[PDB]
Design a protein around this ligand. Structure first.
Ligand SMILES: CCCN(Cc1ccccc1)c1nc(Cl)nc2c1ncn2[C@@H]1O[C@H](COP(=O)(O)CP(=O)(O)O)[C@@H](O)[C@H]1O
Ligand SMILES: CCCN(Cc1ccccc1)c1nc(Cl)nc2c1ncn2[C@@H]1O[C@H](COP(=O)(O)CP(=O)(O)O)[C@@H](O)[C@H]1O
Ligand SMILES: [Zn+2]
Ligand SMILES: [Zn+2]
Ligand SMILES: [Zn+2]
Ligand SMILES: [Zn+2]
Lengths: 524, 524
């Protein structure tokens, strides 16, 4: 009975330090979770009990908190070396700072293999990057060998900044030949480790012959078998079992995000690489598991550089600024309302006497709100708090749109509602009412907008023919999140201030904030 | 043909200077209206054409602008003397500063008779005030005599500060004997000049025998015959004709408010005091009528004391702050939301950790918003502008009421909707929906309120059993405007800051304001 124990994180997103249960900054240490020091402790506990253990990361360590803004990746390489990871697949956000943002910080410093089989470099890059990332890696595990093939999101050119000298092929098309090569090398146990979302994960397990396990990410999927230990709601059992086209039962696993859970899968292999059985569950890394002192001290040695971003208090908040995905991708959220009001507050300028201000409206992709902010620490908001909410460093731009163009974006906002996708829109100066029973593209039942050509701002139904000015993220003006209609049909695009400075300025102007949910978005 | 011309103002409310068409502070002088200097000119033009002319005031010169805050009445005595008024009835706001606030400034300095027949003093006051105001006055007009009887609102003890040494009798009960007294003195032409509202004016004209004309006020009633000259909508023809119980046609007149119009009524009397005919109309005092230089110079001589209230700029506004009665007494108006938003912003104090703040709601009687604020002066907001919006100097108190108490107050808010009454409520942290088709007391179809025991403020239907904290004017906690349920059923009443300082502070904190109409109040 050859047993393998796969440990896997994904979408850790720079939460090196322990976090609150909402993955925001750790306020009350007696209830905090995650961290790489607590992960070390738990990983060790298992490497002692089990002889055959592999530790894998399925992408998206980059971006999320002030840890990445400063060290820009070097912190990721250091503490993944300290955790002695056995392999890592590349995610889209690993290209957030371009290829150069990945080679010098991460690739050149990792002491473990970094994998991606559907990325191929060309031109000046093929010599600069050759050998720094592999399509697969055959790892020794005891007296056997396990092959691990990497894959990265086909859509990463649209999601990030890979550059024009990197081609991203269809995952299944590129993975299949690499798996066949490993089989011809007499490797009968093969793991697919990648970053394309749960739905592609299930397709890779169904169509790629010879994949025994798929360990994925990118969709922050929580799977659990039984009664779950925390707030996260499971999308299915752990592992999710896929029956391949050639007749095999192929487990598919993922461990949410933000370092909260450690995926734990046990696989019973026969002598020929057949999977007899698979069982496990993600392990909640709560306060019961102590942080390893040696890693924690190295954390604090690196933590002294970051305390320069929590020195200055920008303002206070007396409400919970709910920027969780469970809210801002499903309903109106007060962090969404906060961010939009500050966007409108920044574009206030004198104009014609037949107007009160040139722009009265705001839209904001919920997926762009990347973290909540707790108020129980005497409500203080520092730059560190804001850098977790708006980590990407985009801008807040002025656009101009036709009533019909806006109507299509709000139909798109809910065209696949229910899957926790980022395109759900938070709004300002807009009152939208949805009806999901109606068919996609015909679910905006009401859409009223705040008038600009009026001495008293008031709400008036959207007119398709009219033309409106909107403050939106740079991410959306360029067609992000599937908002092609915006990128195509806009009548004007003026660039604006930094998204983090716009929100830093408006919180100091107000000194104390209490944004509410007031019906800007409603459901029939 | 003995003809009499009655000129009458009413509810001037301290608008000594010329004003904007909304009666707010005069921005662009080439379009401004009213003023005592422009009234003078028009009065003169008529005294030259007609030999028999009476100029009357039907009450409520006190309170309304910074002129009254500073000079406290002396400006009324002075500039009513300079226009040589022939008589003045006492209004409710004439007692806003108590009896002594009426005796020393106006009564002792008026060179015209000040009339009120239904007010009788008692105790220590009856010798201090005897002869400073009369129930009637028989004035010579050419070779005839006209009797003028004063009356003041029966409700003045609830509306103002008359004191316990003044009794207010039923108008009709008190006027009849005085009118009978004048008849026995062979006075066959008798005018009723008083301050009880258009509805009582019509009743005084119907039930008091021997009254030939009723010249009233207090309800800012606009009457016009034909096509009106400005925004004001007429409530009826000018004069409104009442058929008395004893068979006479009795004209009843009123001239809006704020000095915008000069009432102009011509009456044809026969030899025995019968009314042969009555016709006229209010005269719009617009820019075509020049301001009298001599009054304007005396106006400017007095204006130097007041310019210390426009020196300091508290903030700016880029929207029209609509504090007009036609908006703020019928529908949501953005001046109401502003005042309520500042009330909630002021009662922010740390509380139990299972709350975001103790108070989330606000109610505000629309009639307490006493002036709009124009923004075309590059929107500067000074103290002078605010003292016109909140002239009374009340406070904003914290009260505690049962859901049923509040449900009753909002049924009262619209229980006689449509007559421009002050009890219509402006709100904050509350979403109310009315249905006027339904019967009074059964017109609040929806009532949602902003939660306090919640880390994310959101709106939840009113629960009758629950208990809520509300910020409301001191005027409402005490049962004003007919909100008895609050005074009776409140579980707590703590006094707060000045109504004018709360709104001055919140306008500086924000630096630039743009309050909108956002659906806090809606109509089925
Ligand atoms: C200046 C733009 C800055 N960037 C990134 C970037 C950098 C460099 C070049 C291009 C783009 C972003 N700007 C905004 Cl405004 N929203 C974003 C951005 N990137 C992700 N989201 C949202 O996130 C959702 C997925 O979140 P997720 O947790 O489900 C899976 P992910 O971990 O792979 O992202 C999506 O549905 C989005 O709504
Ligand atoms: C500290 C309280 C200060 N006072 C007056 C006062 C002074 C001294 C002692 C007691 C009371 C008021 N406070 C407020 Cl907050 N609103 C008020 C007050 N008095 C009238 N309104 C409103 O005005 C409406 C009528 O307006 P109207 O112009 O149509 C006819 P009016 O000229 O005779 O009043 C009414 O329906 C109300 O809603
Ligand atoms: Zn991610
Ligand atoms: Zn991703
Ligand atoms: Zn009045
Ligand atoms: Zn009055």
């Amino acid at each position: 009975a050859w047993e393998l124990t796969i440990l896997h994180t994904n979408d850790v997103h720079s939460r090196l330090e322990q976090t609150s249960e909402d993955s925001s900054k750790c306020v009350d240490a007696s209830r905090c979770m995650g961290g790489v020091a607590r992960l070390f402790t738990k990983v060790q506990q298992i490497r002692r009990a089990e002889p055959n253990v592999l530790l894998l990361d399925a992408g998206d360590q980059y971006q999320g908190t002030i840890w990445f803004t400063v060290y820009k990746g070097a912190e990721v390489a250091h503490f993944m070396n300290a955790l002695r990871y056995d392999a890592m697949a590349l995610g889209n956000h690993e290209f957030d700072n371009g290829v150069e943002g990945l080679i010098e910080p991460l690739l050149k410093e990792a002491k473990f293999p970094i994998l991606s089989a559907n990325i191929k470099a060309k031109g000046p890059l093929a010599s600069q990057i050759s050998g720094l990332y592999l399509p697969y890696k055959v790892l020794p595990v005891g007296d056997e060998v396990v092959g691990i093939v990497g894959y990265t999101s086909k859509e990463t050119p649209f999601l990030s900044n890979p550059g024009t000298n990197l081609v991203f092929e269809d995952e299944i098309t590129a993975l299949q030949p690499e798996v066949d090569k490993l089989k011809t090398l007499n490797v009968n146990k093969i793991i697919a480790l990648g970053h394309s979302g749960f739905e592609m994960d299930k397709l890779i397990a169904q169509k790629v012959r010879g994949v025994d396990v798929v360990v994925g990410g990118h969709s922050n999927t929580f799977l659990y078998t039984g009664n779950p230990p925390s707030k996260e709601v499971p999308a299915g059992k752990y592992p999710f079992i896929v029956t391949s086209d050639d007749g095999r039962k192929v487990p598919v696993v993922q461990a949410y995000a933000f370092g909260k859970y450690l995926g734990y899968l046990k696989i019973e292999f026969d002598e020929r690489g057949n999977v007899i059985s698979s069982h496990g569950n993600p392990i909640l890394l709560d306060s019961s598991i102590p942080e390893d002192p040696s890693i924690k001290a190295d954390i604090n040695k690196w933590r002294i550089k970051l305390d320069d971003y929590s020195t200055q208090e920008l303002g206070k908040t007396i409400v919970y600024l709910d920027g969780s995905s469970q809210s801002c991708r499903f309903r109106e959220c007060n962090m969404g309302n906060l961010i939009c009001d500050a966007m409108i507050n920044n574009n206030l300028r004198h104009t014609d006497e037949m107007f009160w201000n040139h722009v009265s409206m705001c839209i904001l992709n919920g997926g762009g709100i990347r973290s909540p902010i707790d108020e129980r620490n005497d409500g203080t908001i520092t730059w560190e708090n804001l850098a977790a909410v708006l980590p990407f460093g985009g801008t807040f731009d002025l656009v101009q749109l036709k009533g019909s163009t806006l109507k299509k974006a709000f139909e798109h906002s809910v065209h696949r509602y229910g899957q926790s996708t980022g395109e759900f829109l938070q709004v300002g100066g807009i009152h939208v009412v949805y009806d999901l029973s109606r068919k996609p593209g015909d679910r905006v039942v009401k859409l009223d907008v705040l008038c600009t050509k009026c001495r008293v701002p008031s709400y008036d139904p959207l007119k398709m023919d009219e033309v409106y000015k909107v403050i939106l993220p740079n991410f959306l003006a360029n067609g992000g999140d599937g908002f092609q209609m915006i990128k195509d049909e806009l009548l004007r695009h003026d660039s604006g201030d930094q998204d983090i400075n716009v929100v830093s300025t408006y919180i100091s102007k107000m000194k104390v904030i209490y944004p509410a949910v007031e019906g800007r978005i409603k459901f029939s």
